[PDB]
Amino acid sequence: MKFSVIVPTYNSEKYITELLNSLAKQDFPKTEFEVVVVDDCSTDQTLQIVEKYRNKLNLKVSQLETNSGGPGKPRNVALKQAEGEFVLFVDSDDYINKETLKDAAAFIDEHHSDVLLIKMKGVNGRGVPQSMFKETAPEVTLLNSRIIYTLSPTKIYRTALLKDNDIYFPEELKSAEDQLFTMKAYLNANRISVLSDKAYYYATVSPEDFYEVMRLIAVEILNADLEEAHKDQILAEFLNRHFSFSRTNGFSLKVKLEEQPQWINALGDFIQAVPERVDALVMSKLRPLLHYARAKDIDNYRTVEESYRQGQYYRFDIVDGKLNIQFNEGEPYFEGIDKPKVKMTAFKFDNHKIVTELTLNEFMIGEGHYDVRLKLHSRNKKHTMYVPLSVNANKQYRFNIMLEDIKAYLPKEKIWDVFLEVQIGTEVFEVRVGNQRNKYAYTAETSALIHLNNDFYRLTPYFTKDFNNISLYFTAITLTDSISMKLKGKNKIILTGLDRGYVFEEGMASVVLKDDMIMGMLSQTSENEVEILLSKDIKKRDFKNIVKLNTAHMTYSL
Amino acid sequence: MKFSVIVPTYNSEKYITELLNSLAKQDFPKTEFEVVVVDDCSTDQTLQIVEKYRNKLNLKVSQLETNSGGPGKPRNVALKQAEGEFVLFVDSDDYINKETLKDAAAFIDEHHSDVLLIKMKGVNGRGVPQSMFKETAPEVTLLNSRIIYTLSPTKIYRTALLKDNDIYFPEELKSAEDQLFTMKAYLNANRISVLSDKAYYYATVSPEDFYEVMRLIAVEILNADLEEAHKDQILAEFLNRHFSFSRTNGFSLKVKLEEQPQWINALGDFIQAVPERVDALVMSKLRPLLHYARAKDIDNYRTVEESYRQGQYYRFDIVDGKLNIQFNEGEPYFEGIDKPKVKMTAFKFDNHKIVTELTLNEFMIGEGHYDVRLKLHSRNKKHTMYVPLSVNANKQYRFNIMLEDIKAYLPKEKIWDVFLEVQIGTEVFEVRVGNQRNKYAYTAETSALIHLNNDFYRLTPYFTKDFNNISLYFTAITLTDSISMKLKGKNKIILTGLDRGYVFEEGMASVVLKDDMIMGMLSQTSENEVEILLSKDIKKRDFKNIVKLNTAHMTYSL
Amino acid sequence: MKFSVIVPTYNSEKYITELLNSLAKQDFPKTEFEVVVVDDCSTDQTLQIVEKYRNKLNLKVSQLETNSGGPGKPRNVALKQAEGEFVLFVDSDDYINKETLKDAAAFIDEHHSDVLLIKMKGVNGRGVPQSMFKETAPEVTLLNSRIIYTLSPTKIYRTALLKDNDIYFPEELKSAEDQLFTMKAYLNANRISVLSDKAYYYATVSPEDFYEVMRLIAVEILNADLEEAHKDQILAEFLNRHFSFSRTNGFSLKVKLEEQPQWINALGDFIQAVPERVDALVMSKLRPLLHYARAKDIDNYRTVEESYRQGQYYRFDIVDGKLNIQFNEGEPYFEGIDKPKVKMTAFKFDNHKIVTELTLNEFMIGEGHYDVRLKLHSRNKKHTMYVPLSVNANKQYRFNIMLEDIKAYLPKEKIWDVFLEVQIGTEVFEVRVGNQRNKYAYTAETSALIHLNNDFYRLTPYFTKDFNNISLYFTAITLTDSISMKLKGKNKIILTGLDRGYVFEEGMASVVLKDDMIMGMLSQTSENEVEILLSKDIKKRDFKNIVKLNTAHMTYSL
């Protein structure tokens, strides 16, 4: 055979039908795949609905003598019963696509994959991460990709890869038992593949056993058949993920103060299993958690997290976007802790204002103790412009760049670079924003009209070619050469942007003649067109005498 | 017996029945507690009411020869008559819970407590503090707990603890004679417990006798059988409560000038008893007061309290959130002295922006030496929002909360608390506003329409129930279920608020059809109706086809 | 003979007749003055023209054997020949007022001056100090007048003062030689006077010599027959002028680098004769320059001058308006080193907002390290308003003052003066603005209409009489007494300011009736006339029934 579907079931009567159908609707030969469903001793008509697919699917039903309490053992007993060339672990609450086994079998015969990663899609609001399923790579490792950011068994593994190297689910450890199964596959797979052509997989205690599994992963990486420099970098990105997205992230804040001695000890043996040379590779804000984990000093560990949330430190000084923190009278100085990273999460504008939203992802300092201002620096480093913070929420700072405020300053230069100024007392940081951002919500070269001294200019936001950073292009134009004015119907004025697009502020509008004016409603139909739904009909001979044209906050005389 | 309820009555004919019912409704054996009632020579029929409880309770009735002037003497006369193992001082105007004695004996039998503190709860608006009854603790001392913040005799004392140490209420001092009693019992107790499982207690002249009690407390603190360091600390926290809550707090600003020399002499002999070494442990703002109390200088004492009210000082400078104040010409320099009083004098809001005016009534620093920001904190303390200062005048700080800038940050949570950040260099003060304010010029549950991603929400400014503090409530609504759109006449659209009133910005407003628009005005008729006086008339069949409806600066899709 | 006029000439043939005529034209008896011309070995016909006057004047004519290169040796030769009671030096290209000797003679006989300054006047673009010639003064000193700011020898000196004290021009020092001569006269003079009734005097290389003269002056001052504190004070004034206006100012920025060591060595020897106690007496900015001059250290000296000129300092803070500056690593801090100049480069306003731009023309600290706010201060100093910065471009600071934000605070006072507050940490500058400005863009008394609690007010910018600064006058008005409203045609409403112009924001506007509304476009046709071009006709009977008039952002109930 080719595949072998393993399904851990436990009290899944109300939704096993959604999975047994996906396996039946499979666009794949029935003789080249099987479904091994081992039950964890259910108390409902679960096997009785599975047996409704014995004729539609090659089936191997098994049931444990007693309940195990997790998908660990049901997947292991089914792993010994699997006779196919590959395995696919699917929980009973999930389902797959109709062409999942078809596209996977072809992808195997072309790249000869040992571990295959299919892109997942979340239903009913389930994540399911995405940082590794943006492209289709026939070969990845734990450094050049993000496969280390997903460790669930919802992937495709080679049966010989897991049986020869002895890779089974730890039955005794019911806490995150899956993270060891995948990491053992990642370190022992000669080639790891990521498939991302469509949506394939559709998903729906004492900290002792948890921190033991983490220690097992740190040991498997150090003892794998890889280069020593690569072993700690793989272990570093694993600590980059554990201390940021697992339950360890801030346990001294949430876990009861009575049970924190139980946490710091179990976590202590995990970090003690990681060499102290790896601390230079993990994220700099995690090193104070790595030192206080080995020493098992919970009091000094609870303070490091409390010093991060509220941004209060006992003693500190800054050396270029990186601080040197002393969390207590006598504790050592952690140096090289982190210029703050800036990502432009939003960018909207028109002929009235410019609304940007810069978000500070990695800023160790707490919010409120530092002041930020948006800097608009010229290319020749002569003129600049500072726009204050309009409103902020957490580390999302929104600036409202009103054009009327900066109209009399743009004609100084044609290239206005957009920096973000960060200041803490007397230390001013100059971060160039642009290279990290979301998808630009406009078409390229989309400018906005600016009237100034009976002349017309266009403020063109664009990204530089060097480092993809955003700037503002301010140059003089001619109206009749950029935007055409036509009369659609008898109560609509269409402004069509010829060479480029021109966005404008939607809402109320007003056109003016020598002796009459008509009110209208402006609305952006497309990126290079604008409709003005007027109140009364304007005759075409009156359309030739449009003296002035205003918006809801800006005016333009013809 | 296990308990001896001591009841000092005097003309309690109108409310002793509630107490005598609560003492009979106890879920406690009758032979374990006695009610020792000592009347202070009443003028009415108070005793005739007590006598009718002799068949339900083991009653002890007595009456002094003349009125003593308070519960002072009647509490000691009942103490010699009390033969139960423990005493319980309950005023003639208050009453206790059904399970008071029952939950007290079981708790004493489980920890052998010498002073038990039952949780007090006030009726008809009576404080009754709350800081020390947040938890049920088996053992607490005068430095790791707030038990010093409650010196009322309404507690459970061990008959041996009071008698074997000559702990009796002083008779010759009528002012605060009950604080020396509890402090004598606090220091001499080997174990102090606090029972806060439920609500147990329901509570309803020359200063020569006042500060004389305070003097006996300071000497009692210095002559206790504790460590010398623990003596000065218990003496300090006593000064931290006396000078903050008793009559000393600002007496020079209230007492007549002809009687302030009398006050500065009595308060002096109490402060002269406190060694000058203990002042280093008192709160820094009281050290100037403790100095002029020993010197008994009332002209310089009044100078300090007036300086603390208005923020004026003869010569000062700020050194890291702490000021060094000299109150007069030729006086020593008090250094290292360290929240402002806020009253929301105005609050206006609509579907466009929010206007609130927060005023600083009392601050220990002049304007221009600190920054202020408006904080909108979430209930779970996960999210936050800061609005920059729009304008200020002296100490009246006004903020403009533009809804367009904050619409992207509200749906993160549903409850937002309104704080007030005040940063002096780096030390921040987060003041909860709303309780002190002017009259709320709106009706309760008055919300405001908000539009975001074709959804309809409501911003409901409300006041919390625990502390009357203002907050904002964000949740979803159905437009056709909270607001109705009707046609008054032919040129008026009457917006009606059903379940709650909605405020909107008055001014220009337009309705848009598919191929026709209409200009109009917007005037808030009443608090739950809005008039849209249009420019032209509109037929009833066209009123059904209103696709979009805007205000002065906001749009809304129908 | 009252006067001896001493004239050094050198190739003066083209201009010598002007002086000789002015001496011949003196309204003074010829017997009572002589003219002593000593020619510095001219190669033209200077002497022959001079001889033409030997009958009109008592003339002594001499000529040196070789050109001395300067007036020093010629004047000394003449002074040895002078028999006048007084001498007057006039340069060969200068000339004197016809009434000079007559007026000076009378002044001398009334006051017995030993040194007599006579007011100078520059022709053809020359100056010529004036600041010490604003008044006539019979007796001045170096410390209570500005005489130390003019050291040329174009003055009247008592011959016996010079000869008895051996006061001659240094011949071997060719630079600034007249400064030593005049300093010596001042210090020996019993009375120094200034005669300013009219314009009397009409005026048309290595640094070893320059700084050698300066060192002799220091020695001369310190050795004078004056009080010790006075010697130090006089010397401080000489240093103030010398570093500010002599060739010493900025020498490390102008002189070739290879020669700056030579400058600092001659300058160093000069400053080394000045006791260090005197540095405390000099303008604070000069103190670092004095320090490094004494040490003859050009590298640190050049850094100081460059730091001043570019506003960059290695490390500094500001305490109460003065800077503490460390100019280089390891160097001493110089403390208490000394307001920015402000020009109002824009001012626009309407009934909706005020827009003003302030430009810092000169400021000892670069952009970004200070904060600025606009301050409105009531004339009685009781109330204050602060407006945050809206945007800034380099040192151009723009403030948008939204009148809706300040409407509630304006009624407290009538006069609001505009200040710019500049805060650097905790040192605050209050700079009154208006006296430096671009041309005010409105007719005087042009006002804005404000509506507040059913009452109408005008906000009127104006300029003060005493210092021409800008203030805001806020007072109540009666609308129908101040502004007329009339109908022009059928679709235009004209608002005319009757007593003053009223400026309104241009753009959309509306008039509201009790059952109707009409939109329009507002345009400012003149500075006291506003036109609202309505979207339709209005009957005369309904124009009288306008209840409400709205602009783009404001409403006015009529």
Numbering used by the authors:
A (entry chain B), B (entry chain C), C (entry chain A): 1 to 204, 216 to 349, 352 to 571
Study authors write:
In this article we describe the crystal structure of TarS, an enzyme responsible for the glycosylation of wall teichoic acid polymers of the S. aureus cell wall, a process that has been shown to be specifically responsible for methicillin resistance in MRSA. TarS possesses a catalytic domain with a canonical GTA fold (one of two distinct A/B folds characteristic of nucleotide-sugar dependent glycosyltransferases) consisting of two closely associated α/β/α sandwich Rossmann motifs that abut and form a continuous central β-sheet. TarS possesses a D(91)XDD motif with aspartates coordinating a metal cation, a feature that is typical of the GTA superfamily.
The full-length TarS crystals diffracted with strong anisotropy and a high resolution limit of 4 Å was applied. Although TarS was co-crystallized in the presence of the UDP-GlcNAc sugar donor, only the cleaved UDP product seemed to be observed (ligand mFo-dFc simulated annealing omit electron density shown in S2C Fig) and the crystals were too sensitive to withstand soaking in higher concentrations of UDP-GlcNAc as for the TarS1-349 crystals. We propose therefore that the apparent flexibility between the two domains may be related to substrate binding and/or processivity. The physiological relevance of the trimeric architecture is supported by size exclusion chromatography-multiangle light scattering (SECMALS) with an elution profile that corresponds predominantly to a 200 kDa species (theoretical monomer molecular weight is 66 kDa).
